[PDB]
Copies of this chain bind each other. A is one copy, B any other.
Amino acid sequence: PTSDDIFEREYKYGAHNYHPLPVALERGKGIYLWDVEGRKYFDFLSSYSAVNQGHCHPKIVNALKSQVDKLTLTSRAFYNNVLGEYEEYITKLFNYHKVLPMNTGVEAGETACKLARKWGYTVKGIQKYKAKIVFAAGNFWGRTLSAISSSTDPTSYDGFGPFMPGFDIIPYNDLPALERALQDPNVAAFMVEPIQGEAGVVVPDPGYLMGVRELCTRHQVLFIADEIQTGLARTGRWLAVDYENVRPDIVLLGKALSGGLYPVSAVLCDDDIMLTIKPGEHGSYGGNPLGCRVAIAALEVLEEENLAENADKLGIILRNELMKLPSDVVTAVRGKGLLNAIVIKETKDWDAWKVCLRLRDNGLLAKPTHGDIIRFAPPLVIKEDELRESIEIINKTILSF
């Protein structure tokens, strides 16, 4: 079964909702992926930060193998013995009272919007169904009807309406725009990524998150920080918001929360928000004992291998080296920790897709995000010499055009 056969079979029997980079992977371990032909690649996407710990981390694998023989799912009609250990662990780790467990990132975002609205009505005193949520242009939090109703990307929402009302959109990285938007007393929450991943690793200016915190507090608005991609050591801190020492009202986690072994996501917040949802009023596989064992292990790997500090150090090296590329062809380099992107001067001859095809040819896997943006985001377990070898692949590729 060749790579072309894999491409062809999916084309026959699977929906056409993606056009992946033409490479067919069979095995992953740490920073490396192997295709069915046996070729070896640096993984410079890390499954959008879901494998921050590297592919198939043995401690996370071992947690899954141990728990799968015991109990994998009771549903929340009953209690399982694991969920509470995990809740105590993660809430103490991030210093919120409570966690609401879900499965995918978009489910955590949906839960956050529901909390915001219930809190708006029952605590802030907004009149029923006037509550607003404000989002930043370029945000991405998944693909339900609600999440695409807050999107400014036409490919995500065009042809899928009508849309969820009550969602307002302002520019990213713009404190006067947030201040203006929050003059409306019916706003219940502002949801924002500390760095916008799918928009192309858009890093806001120093001080933006501090201003977001202050403005949300000043106007009695919940600050929801979406760290589903940026959290869990990817940017060089436990949360990307830690760079500005700000405490969001709601923090969303996902992706790396399982090391890529299981869909686990989390909504963290204090009692005054969490308990506006009463028994029977929300839920989901959420909180199952298998995913909880996996996530405990995945978090322990992050702390025990000091991956945030490694991501900080190596991300400095990565951005410094990438800035040595010619401004003729690479027009920007941006990122924090090991979440980085370059922008290429797209001609009609070359574009980010062709660059990623050639990087693939040269043993490195990256994906383009808008026709001129390429993300460079290897697992945080990468070592300095591996990183420098990968950078030289990048340099060879870009300078080969």
Indicate whether A160 reaches chain B with its CB closer than 8 angstroms: yes
Q: Indicate if the CB atoms of B72 and A55 lie closer than 8 Å.
A: yes
User: For residue A238, which residues in chain B have a CB less than 8 angstroms away from its CB?
Assistant: none
Beyond A47-B73, A68-B261, A144-B107, is A83–B28 a contact (Cβ under 8 Å)?
A: no
Indicate whether A21 reaches chain B with its CB closer than 8 angstroms: yes
Beyond A80-B25, A107-B104, A146-B144, is A129–B161 a contact (Cβ under 8 Å)?
A: yes
Beyond A6-B81, A75-B47, A367-B77, is A15–B65 a contact (Cβ under 8 Å)?
A: no
Per the 8 Å Cβ criterion, residues 26-41 of A in contact with B are: 26-28, 33, 36
User: For residue A145, which residues in chain B have a CB less than 8 angstroms away from its CB?
Assistant: 110, 113-114, 144-146, 164
Interface string of A297-318 (1 = CB under 8 A from B): 0000000000000000000000
Beyond A128-B161, A142-B284, A284-B142, is A70–B27 a contact (Cβ under 8 Å)?
A: yes
Which residues of A come within 8 Å of B, CB atoms?
1, 3, 6-7, 9-10, 12-28, 33, 36, 45, 47-48, 50-51, 55-56, 61, 64-65, 68-81, 83-85, 87-88, 91, 97-101, 103-104, 106-107, 110, 113-114, 117-118, 121-122, 128-131, 142-146, 155-156, 159-166, 260-263, 267, 274-275, 277-285, 287, 290, 365, 367
Q: Is the interface of A mostly helix, strand, loop or mixed?
A: loop
28 pairs of residues in contact across A and B, judged by CB atoms under 8 Å: A13-B88, A13-B99, A16-B274, A17-B280, A18-B283, A19-B279, A20-B76, A21-B78, A22-B79, A25-B79, A28-B72, A45-B77, A47-B74, A47-B77, A64-B64, A64-B68, A68-B261, A73-B260, A78-B365, A104-B104, A104-B263, A114-B145, A117-B159, A118-B159, A142-B284, A143-B283, A261-B290, A263-B285
Q: Indicate if the CB atoms of B114 and A160 lie closer than 8 Å.
A: yes
- A125 CA to B176 CA in the complex, in Å? 43
- A130 CA to B159 CA in the complex, in Å? 11
> Considering residues A144, A146, A281, which has the most beta carbons from chain B within 10 angstroms of its beta carbon?
A144
Least CB distance, A315 to chain B, in whole angstroms = 21
- A76 CA to B22 CA in the complex, in Å? 11
Q: Indicate if the CB atoms of B75 and A50 lie closer than 8 Å.
A: yes
Known contacts A18-B76, A45-B77, A104-B104, then 18 further A-B pairs from the complex at CB < 8 Å, ordered by chain A residue: A1-B81, A3-B79, A10-B79, A14-B98, A15-B98, A16-B277, A18-B283, A19-B279, A33-B74, A50-B75, A64-B68, A104-B107, A104-B263, A110-B144, A122-B159, A144-B145, A144-B146, A263-B285
- A155 CA to B117 CA in the complex, in Å? 14
The residue in chain B whose Cβ has the minimal distance to the Cβ of A81 is B26
The residue in chain B whose Cβ has the minimal distance to the Cβ of A267 is B15
A263 CB contact (under 8 Å) in B19, B70, B88, B103: B103
> Considering residues A73, A146, A155, A279, which has the most beta carbons from chain B within 10 angstroms of its beta carbon?
A73
